[PDB]
Amino acid sequence: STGSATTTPIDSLDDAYITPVQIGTPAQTLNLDFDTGSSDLWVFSSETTASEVDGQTIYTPSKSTTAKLLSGATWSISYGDGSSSSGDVYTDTVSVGGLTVTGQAVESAKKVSSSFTEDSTIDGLLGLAFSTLNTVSPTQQKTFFDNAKASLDSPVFTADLGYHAPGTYNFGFIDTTAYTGSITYTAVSTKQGFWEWTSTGYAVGSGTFKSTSIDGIADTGTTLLYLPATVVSAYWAQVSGAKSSSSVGGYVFPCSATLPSFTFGVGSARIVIPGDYIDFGPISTGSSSCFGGIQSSAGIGINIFGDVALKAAFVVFNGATTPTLGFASK
Ligand SMILES: Nc1ncccc1CO
């Protein structure tokens, strides 16, 4: 089997992407934020505290003839940005782009933090990291991809995120028309439960490539690209007027600037992030200070190849017995 679904930016900055997902019988379609950085599929629901729902579409398990309460199971997740949600668990049929999984754990939110309430466009998250990170207790549950894997034509999914445009998540096949050149594969460590790999270096604009190992994760749930302070300082030093602002929370730059590209290495291959992709717009409405899309990881503990980086590539998440990541230009 295969599946293919369009993913759409939630706003004009590509802050996140939503993909329609069919849950239950008859189908309830919710727009979920496919997340390479977590292993829980959770949804706003008829159980979510009413004051914490503000425009999201909810899953109502009592209206699904295939929903079953997973007795005793609870979940609670705290994400790297300080957001959180928790609740109980149903199993139900979940379909993405024509690919159907029966008995998928659907984690129903009883509580969500303010940033989840304030995003009316995101009805939940569909985790695509390794199932070892799933938070369901006392019996950890499998991700949608893990459940679908055996049925797929090939045990892979691909992320083709658009710049200010829709893109595609495919399951079970590699669309050879969706990228240019060849796909370069690189080793993955699953020891932390993430799609963790090592970039071979970077360049700023037309500058020379610096060969240096940069360990990080391929996280489509992070908006930005978080890299070591040395790398980030070298990037922003090429933008007149750019500075790190403690009050704003990162590097900012004059909105009148033209940003240089940023290149990252994948083995001997190179992925070029155009400068435009690094512009996240005014820090507040009407400001001439703009927020940068490349930021320091120094306070995180891990480097993060988020949407800024991934949207410049066609990315293969290869879930073979020894997982690997593939990157192609497009
Ligand atoms: N990947 C993620 N998923 C959900 C919330 C936050 C992040 C990243 O900070």
Short mmCIF file of C-alpha atoms and ligand atoms in Angstrom, two decimals:
data_model
loop_
_atom_site.label_atom_id
_atom_site.label_comp_id
_atom_site.label_asym_id
_atom_site.label_seq_id
_atom_site.Cartn_x
_atom_site.Cartn_y
_atom_site.Cartn_z
CA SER A 1 0.00 0.00 0.00
CA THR A 2 0.85 3.69 -0.25
CA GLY A 3 -0.56 7.02 0.85
CA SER A 4 -0.14 10.56 -0.40
CA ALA A 5 -1.47 13.73 1.24
CA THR A 6 -1.00 17.43 0.65
CA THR A 7 0.45 19.47 3.50
CA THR A 8 -0.37 23.18 3.69
CA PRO A 9 1.30 26.05 5.60
CA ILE A 10 -0.89 27.36 8.41
CA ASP A 11 0.05 31.01 7.76
CA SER A 12 2.08 33.28 5.48
CA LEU A 13 5.35 32.54 7.32
CA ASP A 14 5.23 28.72 7.05
CA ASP A 15 5.17 28.55 10.86
CA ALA A 16 3.84 24.99 10.61
CA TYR A 17 2.11 22.71 8.13
CA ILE A 18 -1.21 20.86 8.44
CA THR A 19 -2.25 17.67 6.67
CA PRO A 20 -5.81 16.29 6.63
CA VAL A 21 -6.26 12.97 8.44
CA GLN A 22 -9.40 10.82 8.51
CA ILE A 23 -10.20 9.37 11.95
CA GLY A 24 -13.02 6.99 12.82
CA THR A 25 -16.14 5.68 11.12
CA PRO A 26 -17.71 7.65 9.55
CA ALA A 27 -14.54 9.62 8.96
CA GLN A 28 -13.87 12.72 11.03
CA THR A 29 -11.29 14.80 9.14
CA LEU A 30 -8.86 16.73 11.34
CA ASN A 31 -5.90 18.80 10.17
CA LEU A 32 -2.83 17.53 11.99
CA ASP A 33 0.67 18.89 12.23
CA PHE A 34 2.97 15.91 11.10
CA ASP A 35 5.76 15.91 13.52
CA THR A 36 9.20 14.27 12.88
CA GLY A 37 10.10 15.39 16.50
CA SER A 38 7.47 13.29 18.57
CA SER A 39 5.78 9.79 18.65
CA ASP A 40 2.19 10.61 19.78
CA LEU A 41 -0.83 11.08 17.60
CA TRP A 42 -3.05 13.34 19.67
CA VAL A 43 -6.15 15.34 18.83
CA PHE A 44 -8.44 18.01 20.15
CA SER A 45 -11.56 16.15 21.13
CA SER A 46 -14.97 16.21 22.76
CA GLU A 47 -13.03 15.57 25.99
CA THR A 48 -10.83 18.68 25.75
CA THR A 49 -11.51 21.30 28.45
CA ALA A 50 -13.97 23.62 26.73
CA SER A 51 -12.08 26.81 27.64
CA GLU A 52 -9.00 25.37 25.91
CA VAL A 53 -10.72 24.85 22.53
CA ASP A 54 -10.87 27.93 20.28
CA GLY A 55 -11.87 27.06 16.71
CA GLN A 56 -10.19 23.66 16.30
CA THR A 57 -12.05 20.73 14.83
CA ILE A 58 -12.55 18.03 17.45
CA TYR A 59 -12.60 14.25 17.35
CA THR A 60 -15.70 12.82 19.06
CA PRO A 61 -15.05 9.12 19.72
CA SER A 62 -18.67 8.48 20.72
CA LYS A 63 -19.67 9.20 17.10
CA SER A 64 -17.18 6.69 15.66
CA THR A 65 -18.43 3.11 15.45
CA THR A 66 -14.82 1.85 15.35
CA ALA A 67 -13.53 3.79 18.38
CA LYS A 68 -12.63 1.80 21.49
CA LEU A 69 -11.36 3.21 24.77
CA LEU A 70 -7.89 1.86 25.53
CA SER A 71 -8.64 1.00 29.11
CA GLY A 72 -6.39 2.60 31.70
CA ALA A 73 -4.14 4.33 29.18
CA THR A 74 -3.13 7.94 29.67
CA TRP A 75 -0.66 10.22 27.96
CA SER A 76 1.16 13.42 28.78
CA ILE A 77 3.72 15.02 26.66
CA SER A 78 6.00 18.03 27.28
CA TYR A 79 7.64 19.31 24.06
CA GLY A 80 11.05 21.03 23.65
CA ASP A 81 9.42 24.49 23.25
CA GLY A 82 7.49 24.29 26.62
CA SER A 83 4.10 23.40 25.09
CA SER A 84 2.18 20.42 26.51
CA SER A 85 -0.99 18.35 26.28
CA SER A 86 -2.37 15.26 28.04
CA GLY A 87 -5.40 12.99 28.11
CA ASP A 88 -6.68 9.47 27.56
CA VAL A 89 -6.51 7.09 24.62
CA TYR A 90 -8.78 5.44 22.07
CA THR A 91 -7.97 3.05 19.27
CA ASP A 92 -9.63 3.80 15.94
CA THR A 93 -9.14 3.65 12.20
CA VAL A 94 -6.86 6.39 10.87
CA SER A 95 -6.27 7.11 7.19
CA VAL A 96 -3.75 9.48 5.61
CA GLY A 97 -3.90 10.14 1.90
CA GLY A 98 -5.58 6.80 1.18
CA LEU A 99 -3.37 4.73 3.52
CA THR A 100 -5.42 3.17 6.33
CA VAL A 101 -4.30 1.85 9.72
CA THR A 102 -6.76 0.00 11.93
CA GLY A 103 -6.31 0.01 15.69
CA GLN A 104 -4.21 3.17 15.76
CA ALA A 105 -3.81 4.78 19.17
CA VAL A 106 -5.57 8.14 18.97
CA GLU A 107 -4.64 10.18 22.04
CA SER A 108 -7.57 12.36 23.05
CA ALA A 109 -6.60 15.60 24.74
CA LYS A 110 -8.24 16.49 28.01
CA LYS A 111 -5.86 19.44 28.49
CA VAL A 112 -3.71 21.46 26.10
CA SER A 113 -1.41 24.39 26.80
CA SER A 114 -2.13 27.92 25.65
CA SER A 115 -0.09 27.82 22.44
CA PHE A 116 -2.21 24.77 21.21
CA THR A 117 -5.44 26.70 22.09
CA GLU A 118 -4.21 29.80 20.27
CA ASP A 119 -3.46 27.88 17.02
CA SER A 120 -7.00 27.46 15.65
CA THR A 121 -5.59 25.83 12.49
CA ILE A 122 -3.95 22.82 14.17
CA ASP A 123 -6.35 20.11 15.39
CA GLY A 124 -3.57 17.90 16.79
CA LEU A 125 -0.23 16.42 15.99
CA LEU A 126 0.77 13.12 14.23
CA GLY A 127 4.14 11.97 15.50
CA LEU A 128 6.62 10.39 13.10
CA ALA A 129 9.70 9.93 15.31
CA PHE A 130 10.49 6.51 16.73
CA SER A 131 7.87 4.75 18.83
CA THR A 132 10.28 4.56 21.79
CA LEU A 133 9.32 8.21 22.48
CA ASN A 134 5.58 7.57 22.66
CA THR A 135 4.22 8.79 25.99
CA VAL A 136 1.23 6.47 26.48
CA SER A 137 1.28 4.74 29.86
CA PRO A 138 1.30 2.00 31.07
CA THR A 139 1.54 0.44 27.57
CA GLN A 140 3.52 2.47 25.04
CA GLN A 141 1.82 2.74 21.65
CA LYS A 142 3.13 2.70 18.08
CA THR A 143 3.17 5.60 15.65
CA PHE A 144 1.02 5.65 12.54
CA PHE A 145 4.12 4.95 10.44
CA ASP A 146 5.19 2.03 12.63
CA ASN A 147 1.71 0.51 12.37
CA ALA A 148 1.56 1.01 8.59
CA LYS A 149 5.14 -0.06 7.85
CA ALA A 150 4.60 -3.75 7.15
CA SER A 151 1.79 -2.98 4.69
CA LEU A 152 3.70 -0.33 2.77
CA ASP A 153 5.28 -1.08 -0.58
CA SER A 154 8.57 0.23 0.89
CA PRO A 155 9.07 1.11 4.59
CA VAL A 156 9.56 4.83 4.00
CA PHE A 157 7.84 8.16 4.15
CA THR A 158 8.89 11.39 2.48
CA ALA A 159 8.48 15.06 3.41
CA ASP A 160 8.29 17.60 0.58
CA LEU A 161 7.43 20.84 2.36
CA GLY A 162 6.67 23.92 0.31
CA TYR A 163 8.03 27.44 0.65
CA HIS A 164 4.94 29.61 0.97
CA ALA A 165 3.08 26.85 -0.85
CA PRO A 166 1.56 23.41 -0.29
CA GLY A 167 3.71 20.30 -0.32
CA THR A 168 3.31 16.56 0.10
CA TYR A 169 3.80 13.74 2.59
CA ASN A 170 4.05 10.34 0.88
CA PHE A 171 4.02 6.93 2.57
CA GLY A 172 5.42 3.77 1.05
CA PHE A 173 7.06 5.09 -2.11
CA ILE A 174 9.57 7.63 -3.39
CA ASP A 175 8.15 9.97 -6.07
CA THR A 176 11.10 10.22 -8.44
CA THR A 177 9.49 13.22 -10.18
CA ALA A 178 9.50 15.29 -6.96
CA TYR A 179 13.22 16.08 -6.80
CA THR A 180 16.21 16.94 -8.98
CA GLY A 181 19.49 15.05 -9.15
CA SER A 182 19.97 12.12 -6.81
CA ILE A 183 19.05 11.42 -3.19
CA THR A 184 22.01 11.27 -0.82
CA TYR A 185 21.43 8.96 2.12
CA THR A 186 23.09 9.39 5.49
CA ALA A 187 23.23 7.34 8.68
CA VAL A 188 20.70 7.78 11.48
CA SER A 189 21.07 7.19 15.19
CA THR A 190 17.84 6.18 16.94
CA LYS A 191 19.43 6.26 20.42
CA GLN A 192 17.44 9.35 21.45
CA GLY A 193 14.29 8.31 19.54
CA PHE A 194 14.78 10.98 16.85
CA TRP A 195 15.80 11.02 13.19
CA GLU A 196 19.28 12.05 14.32
CA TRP A 197 22.03 12.43 11.72
CA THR A 198 25.32 14.26 11.15
CA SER A 199 25.67 17.04 8.61
CA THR A 200 29.08 17.35 6.99
CA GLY A 201 29.33 21.14 7.20
CA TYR A 202 28.00 24.44 5.97
CA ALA A 203 28.54 27.51 3.82
CA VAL A 204 27.21 31.06 4.13
CA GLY A 205 26.12 32.62 0.84
CA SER A 206 28.78 32.24 -1.84
CA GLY A 207 31.43 31.56 0.80
CA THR A 208 33.65 28.52 1.04
CA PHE A 209 32.24 25.33 2.53
CA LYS A 210 33.41 24.59 6.06
CA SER A 211 33.78 20.87 6.66
CA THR A 212 32.63 20.12 10.20
CA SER A 213 30.36 17.49 11.73
CA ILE A 214 27.03 18.88 12.98
CA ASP A 215 24.85 16.31 14.78
CA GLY A 216 21.17 17.19 14.76
CA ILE A 217 17.63 15.98 14.22
CA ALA A 218 15.31 16.25 11.24
CA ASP A 219 12.25 17.90 13.05
CA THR A 220 9.35 19.18 10.81
CA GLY A 221 7.59 20.37 14.06
CA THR A 222 10.30 22.96 14.59
CA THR A 223 9.80 26.05 12.39
CA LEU A 224 13.37 27.14 12.35
CA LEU A 225 16.93 25.90 11.90
CA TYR A 226 18.83 25.69 15.21
CA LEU A 227 22.62 25.31 14.89
CA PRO A 228 25.74 25.83 17.02
CA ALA A 229 26.45 29.40 18.08
CA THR A 230 29.66 29.53 16.01
CA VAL A 231 27.79 28.63 12.83
CA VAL A 232 24.91 31.02 13.52
CA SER A 233 27.26 33.89 14.34
CA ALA A 234 29.09 33.30 11.05
CA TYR A 235 25.78 33.44 9.17
CA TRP A 236 24.42 36.64 10.75
CA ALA A 237 27.80 38.40 10.50
CA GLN A 238 27.09 38.56 6.75
CA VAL A 239 23.87 40.58 7.28
CA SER A 240 24.41 44.27 7.96
CA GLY A 241 22.65 45.31 11.13
CA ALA A 242 21.84 41.82 12.32
CA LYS A 243 22.24 41.17 16.03
CA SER A 244 21.24 38.75 18.75
CA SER A 245 18.55 40.34 20.91
CA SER A 246 18.07 38.92 24.39
CA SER A 247 14.77 40.78 24.72
CA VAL A 248 13.35 39.37 21.48
CA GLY A 249 14.86 35.91 22.00
CA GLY A 250 17.25 35.48 19.09
CA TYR A 251 18.86 37.00 16.06
CA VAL A 252 16.97 39.82 14.38
CA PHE A 253 17.87 41.78 11.28
CA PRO A 254 16.67 44.84 9.38
CA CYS A 255 13.64 44.03 7.28
CA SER A 256 15.29 46.00 4.44
CA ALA A 257 18.13 43.47 4.20
CA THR A 258 18.58 40.83 1.52
CA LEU A 259 19.63 37.63 3.26
CA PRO A 260 22.36 35.27 2.01
CA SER A 261 21.65 31.63 1.39
CA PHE A 262 22.81 28.94 3.80
CA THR A 263 24.16 25.60 2.60
CA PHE A 264 24.31 22.42 4.67
CA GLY A 265 26.20 19.25 3.79
CA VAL A 266 24.68 15.79 3.46
CA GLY A 267 27.68 13.54 2.86
CA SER A 268 29.35 14.98 -0.23
CA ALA A 269 26.07 16.60 -1.35
CA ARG A 270 24.87 20.10 -0.55
CA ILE A 271 21.40 21.50 0.17
CA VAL A 272 21.02 25.24 -0.39
CA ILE A 273 18.49 27.16 1.70
CA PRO A 274 17.69 30.37 -0.21
CA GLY A 275 18.04 33.57 1.78
CA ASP A 276 14.32 34.33 1.51
CA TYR A 277 13.53 31.15 3.45
CA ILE A 278 15.41 32.61 6.46
CA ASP A 279 13.15 35.71 6.73
CA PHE A 280 10.45 35.24 9.40
CA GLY A 281 9.14 38.77 9.13
CA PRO A 282 8.57 41.60 11.56
CA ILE A 283 9.02 40.76 15.23
CA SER A 284 5.70 42.57 15.83
CA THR A 285 3.23 44.05 13.38
CA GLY A 286 4.67 47.11 11.67
CA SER A 287 8.19 46.67 13.03
CA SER A 288 11.21 47.08 10.75
CA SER A 289 13.09 44.47 12.80
CA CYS A 290 12.66 40.98 11.35
CA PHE A 291 13.13 37.63 13.04
CA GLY A 292 15.79 35.30 11.67
CA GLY A 293 15.13 31.73 10.60
CA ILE A 294 18.56 30.48 11.71
CA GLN A 295 19.03 30.58 15.48
CA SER A 296 21.44 29.25 18.05
CA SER A 297 20.88 25.80 19.57
CA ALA A 298 23.15 26.65 22.51
CA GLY A 299 20.22 26.65 24.95
CA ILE A 300 18.49 23.56 23.53
CA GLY A 301 21.03 20.76 23.91
CA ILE A 302 20.57 19.52 20.33
CA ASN A 303 20.80 20.98 16.84
CA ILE A 304 17.49 20.98 14.97
CA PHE A 305 17.02 20.83 11.19
CA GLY A 306 13.49 22.23 11.28
CA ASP A 307 11.12 23.37 8.51
CA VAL A 308 13.56 26.15 7.30
CA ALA A 309 16.08 23.48 6.33
CA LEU A 310 13.77 20.63 5.41
CA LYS A 311 11.60 22.68 3.01
CA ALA A 312 14.70 23.25 0.86
CA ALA A 313 14.92 19.49 0.22
CA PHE A 314 13.02 16.38 -0.68
CA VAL A 315 13.56 14.31 2.46
CA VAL A 316 13.31 10.53 2.75
CA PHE A 317 12.67 9.01 6.17
CA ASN A 318 13.76 5.42 5.55
CA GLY A 319 12.35 3.14 8.25
CA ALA A 320 14.17 0.00 7.20
CA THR A 321 15.63 -2.23 9.91
CA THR A 322 18.59 0.15 9.98
CA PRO A 323 16.95 3.55 9.39
CA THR A 324 18.56 6.20 7.22
CA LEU A 325 17.72 9.70 6.00
CA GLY A 326 17.87 10.85 2.38
CA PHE A 327 18.09 14.40 1.06
CA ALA A 328 17.71 15.65 -2.51
CA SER A 329 17.50 19.12 -3.97
CA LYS A 330 14.25 20.03 -5.69
N1 LIG B 1 8.53 19.14 17.34
C1 LIG B 1 7.71 19.73 18.19
N2 LIG B 1 6.49 19.23 18.32
C2 LIG B 1 5.61 19.81 19.13
C3 LIG B 1 5.90 20.93 19.84
C4 LIG B 1 7.16 21.47 19.73
C5 LIG B 1 8.10 20.89 18.89
C6 LIG B 1 9.47 21.48 18.70
O1 LIG B 1 9.76 22.41 19.71
#
